Design goal:
Major capsid protein (chain B), 2 chains, 1 helix, about 0% strand, little secondary structure, virus, part of a larger assembly, about 50 residues, rod-shaped
Amino acid sequence: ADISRAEVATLIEEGYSHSLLAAAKQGSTVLSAFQNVNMGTKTTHLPVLAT
Amino acid sequence: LPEADWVGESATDPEGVIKTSKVTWANRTLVAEEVAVIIPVPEAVIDDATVE
């Protein structure tokens, strides 16, 4: 007979590390690629030349 | 070169034993040998020559 690792139970504790717990966030492409128009209401009309 | 191995923790299982291994050496030799030449000349030719 002998004392295994299972025989000592929770006299052996398991540790924790947050060294893999990070994620860099990525913003939208279109809000950096193009002009951000500040709107004050739901609809803005923009006339364009058409013919 | 010796070889290590991964060992299990069990007291009964064959994978639980640490394996034996060895380091070895060999020999190389320096062995000295002669290389030589003899050049003969007339002594009158040594005396008559303008160079040493």
